[model samples]
Target: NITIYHNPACGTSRNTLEMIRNSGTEPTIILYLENPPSRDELVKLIADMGISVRALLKKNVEPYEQLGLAEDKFTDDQLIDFMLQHPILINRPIVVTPLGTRLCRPSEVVLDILQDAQKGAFTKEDGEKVVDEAGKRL
Candidate 1:
């Protein structure tokens, strides 16, 4: 199964979903802000992703500097607590495929973990051709 922790309003997140669908397999879309993950689920995802808690921290809503998230004094668990309270603080478009789990930051990153061959070409916003009609990736 392929799943994408998606935020429709986000460009990169939206693009990642499109890429997956183009692969001829629809993915489970978790609207993470509207439906936040449980502490257990969140921790599990981090463990699966193999990235630091800080790496998943969302910088999009940065004015919470008052919350002191920038401080190294705050422990990893403390950051997760903050993210739990505000789901928007968790960075977006985490892709989970049978192949692997990863934070699909640039959207193009999804291509690496996708299971199906894309049915056709997709010219990204960057406009450099990455995939072709023959289901080839380059």
Candidate 2:
């Protein structure tokens, strides 16, 4: 099934989720801030996206500079661990499927996933209306 690592407080993330629903594809919503991915999962995700751990990061976040992540001194696994602890440092709404994964930066990647799924290449969840600010599930 498709999984979307979401942060409800982020407008872009919310928009991504909405786009996924509008695409008629349901996705597993992962509130990364609450139940962050493990290091191994993060590694796998990075590989799936064909990107480095740095690419998965939201470099604009304070922690990116404060943690000196830009220096690239840490190993890939270290960066992933940092993201697990400080999820805000990671980019929002990363959509993943067995076929591949992508960071929904513009929130349009949801459409890409939908198109791919329609070809019967991937599985997806049922869409749900998002009504929460952070995971309060209103």
Candidate 3:
């Protein structure tokens, strides 16, 4: 099974979704902006991602600066709480699959978790070639 925490407003998120679909698997898309994850769910996701709380945060958001998320004084729970309060603070396009879980930042990161058999030739939304015509990773 595959799942994606998606934000249509994000180009990277859209590109990641496209990549997943092009791999021939229809993932369960969660519009996280409208249906935000609970605090516990978010915590588990962050843990599953094998990254620190700061890594999952979107520092460019308004609340990040307004709430002083960069101060380094806040606890993980505090940061999670802030994320709950402001969904925009959470980084986007978190993909979960049988292969692995990843925060698909550049969108191409999704290729890592995609099954080898499912992969095929494709170009990114930005016109970058990820796979060749022979269905090999480029």
lDDT of 1 by residue, 15-104 (tens): 889899988898988999888889998998899989999999987485346586776887889899998998888898999999888888
**Collision pairs in model 1:** none
Q: Please give the ranking of all candidate structures by TM-score, highest first, separated by commas.
A: 3, 1, 2
Would you estimate the TM-scores of all the predictions? 0.89, 0.74, 0.92
Which ten-residue region of model 3 has the weakest summed lDDT? Answer: 116-125
Candidates' C-alpha lDDT: 0.85, 0.72, 0.87
List clashing residue pairs in candidate 2: 26-125
Give residue 74's lDDT in candidate 1 (0 to 100). 73
Worst 10 residues of 2 by lDDT: 117-126
Which segments of candidate 1 are over 4 A away from where they belong?
Answer: 125-128, 134-138
Across residues 41-134, which tens digit of lDDT does each residue of candidate 3 receive?
8988898888988889998779988888889899988888988888888899999989888899989889889884435677877788877878
Tens-place lDDT digits, model 2, residues 1-138:
778999988877877776666546688999987888888788777888777777888887888989988795988778888888898888888887655688877665555555532221222223443333332222
Which candidate tops lDDT?
Answer: 3
